[PDB]
Ligand binder design. Structure first.
Ligand SMILES: N=C(N)N1CCCCC1
Lengths: 246, 10
């Protein structure tokens, strides 16, 4: 997250931190995700496609720091890794960038809701806020595009939804943005998602519910004028989600 | 890796 503010997991208690175990036992951060039910985390397929074996991943909930433990946190193995069949990546962007992880503790349990671990609601089908609406993004991604390191402390910021017409201007991304994607950005382009925020939640208030509106997917640079962040449009994937979680 | 990726391994 470029700009924005540091936060803690109580402010985004559905946030899941996803790591990958390596050849030698070392463990590195992969992507964010969101807890949509006690056994299911939703994220992006591009986070997993290069190493698609479920055994190589660990998921934490209730975690506020990247490489240190947070009191109350829970650690999970991945019982099932479900990637979207129609995923693609071009030279620029990702399509159908959505993924589901079924989580299970070494004791065979799912998540236990607490002050630091809660689920987020899915949206009504094809139901999205008006453009101009302010939404939150959360992640352990880079604080600056040129940084080598990731922040140790979770961050969050606010961006506004951009109309599909505006985002599809060649001025922005042209045809690379589809109806199954959502664009959001800061009016001054001063805050944004960045490298390592992928898979994480874009959360808006529709009616009176905090709702998972998007999943961090792609973008040209970070906090770059006329280059918004692009998000998987969750309200367009409800049959796929329900079908695979039933 | 696509050019506009935010995957940390890219
Ligand atoms: N929002 C931006 N700029 N992104 C999304 C996450 C991948 C890096 C580019």
């Amino acid at each position: 997250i470029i700009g924005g503010e540091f936060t803690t997991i109580e402010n985004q208690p559905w946030f899941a931190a996803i790591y990958r175990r390596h050849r030698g036992g070392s463990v590195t951060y992969v992507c964010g995700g969101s807890l949509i039910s006690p056994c299911w985390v939703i994220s992006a397929t591009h986070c997993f496609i290069d190493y698609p074996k479920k055994e190589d991943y660990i998921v934490y909930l209730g975690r506020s720091r990247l490489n240190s433990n947070t009191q109350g946190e829970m650690k999970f193995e991945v019982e099932n890794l479900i990637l979207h069949k129609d995923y693609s990546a071009d030279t620029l962007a990702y399509h159908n960038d959505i993924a589901l992880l079924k989580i299970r503790s070494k004791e065979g349990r799912c998540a236990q809701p607490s002050r630091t671990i809660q689920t987020i609601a899915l949206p009504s089908m094809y139901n999205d806020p008006q453009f101009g609406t302010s939404c939150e993004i959360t992640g352990f991604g880079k604080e600056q595009s040129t940084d080598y390191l990731y922040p140790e402390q979770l961050k969050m910021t606010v961006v506004k939804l951009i109309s599909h017409r505006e985002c599809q201007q060649p001025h922005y991304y042209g045809s690379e943005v589809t109806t199954k994607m959502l664009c959001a950005a800061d009016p001054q382009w001063k805050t944004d998602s960045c490298q390592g925020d992928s898979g994480g939640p874009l959360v808006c208030s529709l009616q009176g519910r905090m709702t998972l509106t998007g999943i961090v997917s792609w973008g040209r640079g970070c906090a770059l004028k006329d280059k918004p962040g692009v998000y998987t449009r969750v309200s367009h994937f409800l049959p796929w989600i329900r079908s695979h979680t039933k | 890796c696509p050019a506009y990726s935010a995957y940390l391994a890219c």
